[PDB]
Design a protein around this ligand. Structure first.
Ligand SMILES: OC[C@H]1O[C@@H](O)[C@H](O)[C@@H](O)[C@@H]1O
Ligand SMILES: OC[C@H]1O[C@@H](O)[C@H](O)[C@@H](O)[C@@H]1O
Lengths: 825, 829
């Protein structure tokens, strides 16, 4: 018993106002007097960070959305969201800030890795599965970012200018599917504008569509700081401003607007408060099922074998095999192999930003291979591809003459009020594990005028002789000292490189075995952050040469390449679709030296493979979460048979893509020039060849399918597809994909549209039948912009059933006589 | 060598934003780096209160605006300007929040008293004159409130709905006249809306009209808290938010708006900042001439004879003699008088609100007469008419074991952060006004504190005493540590604190003459149940029926009775409007009784706006004094006795009955709106068009001498009208001033006009038999235009016009016609 209307009747005006914003970054407002508790929310869509970045409680990191979507497996995505709920309860977060489902209208989007698919049906069913899995556990979902936050560049002001047809068919559509099938408890409004109006105060989006048309009854929260007005946001449907303390909705701003008849009425305030109360009721109603403790502690209690195995399956099923000539794959355990490449020993579990977290652990691909084979594995780096140098904390000690324990590994961070007599004391001390230090709450730290200083210390011991490059990045100020000798100055002259500085570096000749003193004196942000790193310097030409040489001296090479969460991050978009640095040269040399090299690529979004024609085996890993390396091993050796399909089009070159010319905010606007033609919708219409198309992925076995039954009423389509593993060696899963085409429509349309899919597991020689039933209106409508309505048009239509958007294997023609106009769900 | 553009180029973005709001109730932002000092500003339009209300430095209270305009004396008004400036310097206020020129479309307006006149011409010229005086002495004026802040009711939300023609002709006009002749340094935007949009964010008012059309380059400040958006107020031309600390213009609100492309660009901000820079430049460029000292102290250095001379004079010339049958006046020293009435011994210097201040002294009328004759004068109170009961601090002592001295005369006030001491201040005024109470240990954003109020009280009489408590916050009143008055439990809504505080709660007790009693008031400030305030008071109860009789009989045994009546600054105040035009309580019944027993009585009324005199027909001598400021009593004497020959003329129409007024049915905010239904027909323009008779018509007042005039030269050119008027004091006993008023009529206009409109005036002082000539020059377009709403331009229409020269709107003595051959349409100034 938490009663929304009786509480609305009992709250005073000031309490009403106080419910319309969050208290701090993660919490709503407790109202002891009426039994209304504070609710914790937490990022993000691929696992749960909890209440802090710096010194964060470790957690279960899932694979990233585009990887998730590539499973084409609702049941699994549903399991995944169920796991995300357990991870959340472990952090005592009653509400998750995920899934994310904006749209990769082009490939360069900085958060492209974080959403699901360029296809609105796949995005919407992925979204709907994850939310259903979260909410079945009684943890609330927050679908974000509503809507058209499809690039990062200047997102707070960016105006997405988009027709009502593209808006309905591509960008609103995954939210519609999620609402219709999963009823999320919350939605987060976007930072941007749509057609001139910030989403967070758009009556069209937040009220006309979400409320009047869809009848969705959940709670809208702003993206963080993504509120832009006092009264209009309240009038126009933004239920709660995050984070607190409130900027736009103080008691004085709000009640002054009420008393002065400016814009809003008490009815507007109530309407927003009611919606907050309903989200609160969902949380309180599930407290018995979840065990959430208000302002409770955060643990690593979900860090179990059950969780590890599941994160492993999810990661392995995300992987997409893109090429496999000559049976390079699977590898045999007895193959003589070398592992090469910049991503080989990296732990690229996620993209950057709010979706990232602190992990229990991350298994590198190298380690995955080591674990697989149960012994040492030859290795060479081949080339570097980092955006900035980190790795200092990850390879440092407090006192070198003590063993590399967990208690002794890392750096000590000592916080100070002043930068001081011998006798000032640290007001906080933390063991620092990761080099990038992100800021953070303390009583000696003034909330929004936060001035403090960090003394970061430890010992670094070189494992090889030669040159080593040290680095510092600060937002604020700091100085780097090695053996109490200044080596890098980020105090005196500063250059912006997005709020903070450019990396400054110092190359130094060091000696294997010897203990050097690392001390970094940092100055608080005027809330801040910094990164002191170190990397062993290499001779790039010689290292390419070496990797080539080594590759020639082994049967097989495994080259692990790609991008990382610094190249793909909330905050900015990519400049280009290139792999970094000398990667491409590394790859050319290795392919020349051993043509039977398997290439495994980790990225959230497409990259150009210029050497593609010479690459005989190519695997798309994605960013795999905690178990990424094990999952990769599973696929390479065939303990998992690759079963993922691309959730994205993979064009040859950046210029081929439909958003090539409009993927930048210029004069504050982004024109959606391609209209409905996004992803494969674009490339099939132009008949432009791509490297790999939507829905593509190979297996180690072969499959065949046909429509084995088909029926249409005036209202419905039922289709039965027979699928069979025609191989005699591997069991495996195939993804049946159902596309619709209009054969004689008055209106321009995509060549075909995904409207169904089923994933089916088959032992060698096994045959199964999957059923796919849809209401016509789901399958064949388009949005009629002039009439302001969806339209099931009379005509002839074709269903195409296949294993990719290209690989169509069975079709059926049918007729539609019953025309229908509609709105809503 | 303060260079507006150099500074604007130099300020960083956070410095820019910090300029767009004030730091506290009274100061702008110091930018030390750039030698931009904190400008102090101060209320009000009739005297300079200074930086605090409670425990405030005493000042020179001028008479209230309707009084001032009644002088019809530009020179004298310009002189009061200078005096106001000098009083401003004494307080280290570089900027004055005045003059006030909203418009008495009806008589009931809470701040009716504060403005000048229902006449756009009179109010414009009074405004211009007062402003010229102020700014010749280098102190900046702030003409307020722009615009249509014409009742008090719900004024933060009130939507003044008014045609463009009325807007232009009546409400905007006095601002137009002030900008045109006087160029005030600042203007203050009104709290209210005009046709659906809050003044403080109306592009139409603040930019299209004020900037684009009039070309005025001053700075716009908000009324206090009257900002309602972050970005739209910045974009639509509101230069600075008052008071600090900012609500709508925090560095975060503004810079988030800018960075998120929400509504405002950096241009808009520059544009605001710039105007602010100019106001500051004015102040800086006059620091030598004025000697103002940034965050300076507050002195009473101007409490001087010279200054008192002038207040006495300005007060004297504001008085309007309305009736004088049978030569009851001037009173003669040898006359046997008794002074009677509710306002005889009271000190009603001003109207209520931000116009008020702490005075050096107020000479009551009773005292004024005492001073003139120099002997005890017989008196009886006659009746009470206070709205609420005060007095308690005034007539009390810290220790009963001491004499009635300076620092023993008051109560002690102690301030705690917990209920029952950061500050201790000795209190002499019963109204404890905490609105701008500042303190190191008080949060301006949340002013949470308590007051214990203490001292002892000694009654000079035997009977019932009525005690009173009034609060905004919470209060408890104990006499002798016994609970007598409860303002904690079940509060009601009444008129205290601009209508926000409590109804008066009182306790009748029996007391003993000379007996010491203990007074303890325990007060919680506003946040505990704006900082707020409270009032504890006491008054001697009277037999109300007997007290009338007593006065009536006493009046009968004297040659002449002097009956002092009217309102005061609790009946008439910022914050709410009057409910009716009635004299308070048993006042009328006193006058009916006194008039019947002694037909030789002079009534002196004090009000800022009209009241009904239902016994008008029986009163033979009737004088209107307004609210006279410090020298109010001495000025009443001067005119009563003929040392000043009454010379004021009414700034307002004075109808017989409230129902008679144009705004009878729409002088209340309803559904957040006020429909200005009478359109241009405001004041005399209403009455003359309806041929409705009034008790006393606009521009009316008597003398103790007689006058005649005629037009002795009349010339028309293309742009100008020259008129000459010969005026003679045709009496033989008294020297005096007559006011020549010049009105205009359109005779065959295509458009409904008023019967005539005030367009020029002159005051001329004439010894018995003296004749003089006065010369009025006016530009044609400014005399005879109406606003053509359809074309959105002023129109000088072809046809015939009539000029009426008279000594009131109802006493035309001479006329002249001219023809206008060719029309002109025009905008601007
Ligand atoms: O980190 C909290 C939130 O902040 C914003 O930066 C992001 O756009 C959201 O996706 C995220 O949930
Ligand atoms: O004191 C500052 C301001 O206070 C407000 O209450 C009044 O409306 C203004 O006229 C005055 O100048």
């Amino acid at each position: 018993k938490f009663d929304v209307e009786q509480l609305l009747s009992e709250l005073n005006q000031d309490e009403k106002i106080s419910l319309l914003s969050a208290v701090d970054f993660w919490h709503t407002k407790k109202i002891e007097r009426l039994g209304i508790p504070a609710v914790r929310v937490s990022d993000g869509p691929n696992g749960i960070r909890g209440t802090k970045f710096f010194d964060g409680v470790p957690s279960g990191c899932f694979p990233n959305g585009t990887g998730l979507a590539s499973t084409f497996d609702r049941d699994l995505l549903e399991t995944a969201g169920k796991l995300m709920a357990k991870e959340s309860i472990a952090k005592n977060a009653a509400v998750i800030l995920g899934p994310t489902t904006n749209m990769q209208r082009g490939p360069l989007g900085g958060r492209g890795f974080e959403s699901f698919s360029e296809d609105p049906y796949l995005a919407g069913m992925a979204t709907s599965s994850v939310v259903k899995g979260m909410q079945g556990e009684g943890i609330a979902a927050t679908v974000k970012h509503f809507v058209c936050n499809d690039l990062e560049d200047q997102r707070f002001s960016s105006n997405s200018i988009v027709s009502e047809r593209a808006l309905r068919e591509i960008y609103l559509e995954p939210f519609r599917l999620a609402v219709k099938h999963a009823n999320p408890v919350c939605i987060m409004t976007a930072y941007n504008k749509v057609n001139g109006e910030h989403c967070s105060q758009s009556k069209k989006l937040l009220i006309d569509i979400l409320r009047d048309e869809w009848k969705w009854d959940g709670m809208l929260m702003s993206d963080w700081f993504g509120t832009y007005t006092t009264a209009a946001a309240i009038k126009n449907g933004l239920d709660i401003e995050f984070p607190g303390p409130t900027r736009w909705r103080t008691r004085a701003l709000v009640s002054h607007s009420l008393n002065s008849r400016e814009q809003i009425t008490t009815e507007d305030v109530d309407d927003r408060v009611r919606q907050v109360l309903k989200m609160i009721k969902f949380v309180v109603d599930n407290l018995e099922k979840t065990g959430i403790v208000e302002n409770g502690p955060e643990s690593t209690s979900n860090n179990t074998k059950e969780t590890s195995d599941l994160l492993r399956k999810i990661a392995a099923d995300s992987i997409v095999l893109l090429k496999n000539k000559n049976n390079i794959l699977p590898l045999k355990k007895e193959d003589n192999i070398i592992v090469i490449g910049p991503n080989a020993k990296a732990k690229t579990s996620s993209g950057g930003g709010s979706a990232s977290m602190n992990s229990y652990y991350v298994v590198s691909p190298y380690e995955g291979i080591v674990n697989k084979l149960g012994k040492e594995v030859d290795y060479t780096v081949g080339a570097y591809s980092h955006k900035s140098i980190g790795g200092l904390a990850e390879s440092s000690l407090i006192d070198a003459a003590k063993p590399a324990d967990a208690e002794n590994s890392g750096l000590i961070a000592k916080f100070y009020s002043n930068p001081r007599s011998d006798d000032e004391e640290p007001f906080h001390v933390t063991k620092v594990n990761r080099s990038n230090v992100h800021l953070f709450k303390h009583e000696k730290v003034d909330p929004k005028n936060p001035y403090f200083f960090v003394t970061l210390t430890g010992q670094y011991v070189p494992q090889e002789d030669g040159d080593y490059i040290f680095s510092l990045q600060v937002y604020g100020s700091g100085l780097f000292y090695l053996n109490d000798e200044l080596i890098i100055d980020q105090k005196h002259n500063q250059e912006r490189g997005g709020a903070g500085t450019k990396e400054r570096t110092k190359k130094l000749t060091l000696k294997k075995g010897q203990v050097y003193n690392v001390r970094v004196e940092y100055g608080s942000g005027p809330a801040g952050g910094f990164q002191a790193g170190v990397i062993k310097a290499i001779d790039d030409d010689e290292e390419i040469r070496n990797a080539a040489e080594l590759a020639a001296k082994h049967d097989k090479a495994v080259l692990i390449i790609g991008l990382n969460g610094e190249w793909e991050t909330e905050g900015y978009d990519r400049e280009n679709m290139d792999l970094p640095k000398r990667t491409n040269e590394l790859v050319r040399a290795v392919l020349k030296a051993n043509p039977n090299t398997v290439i495994v690529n980790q990225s959230g979004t497409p990259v150009e493979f210029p050497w593609l024609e010479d690459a005989n085996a190519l695997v798309q890993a994605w960013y795999g979460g905690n178990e990424l390396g094990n999952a990769i091993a599973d696929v390479l050796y065939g303990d998992v048979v690759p079963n993922g399909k691309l959730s994205l089009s993979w064009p040859f070159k950046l210029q081929d893509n439909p958003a090539f010319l409009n993927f930048k905010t210029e004069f504050g606007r982004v024109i959606y020039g391609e209209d409905i033609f996004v992803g494969y919708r674009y490339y099939e219409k132009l008949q432009r060849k791509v490297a790999f198309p939507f829905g593509y992925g190979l297996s180690y076995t072969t499959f065949e399918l046909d429509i084995s039954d088909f029926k249409v009423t005036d209202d419905k389509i039922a289709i039965s597809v027979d699928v069979k593993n025609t191989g005699d060696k591997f069991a495996g899963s195939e993804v049946v994909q159902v596309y619709f085409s209009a054969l004689n429509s008055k209106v321009s349309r995509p060549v075909k549209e995904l409207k169904g899919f089923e994933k089916v597991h088959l032992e060698p020689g096994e045959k199964k039948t999957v059923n796919i039933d849809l209401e016509l209106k789901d399958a064949i409508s388009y949005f009629n912009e002039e009439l302001g309505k969806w339209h099931v048009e009379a005509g002839e239509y074709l269903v195409s059933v296949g294993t990719s958007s290209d690989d169509i294997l069975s079709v059926k023609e049918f007729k539609v006589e019953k025309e229908l106009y509609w709105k809503g769900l």
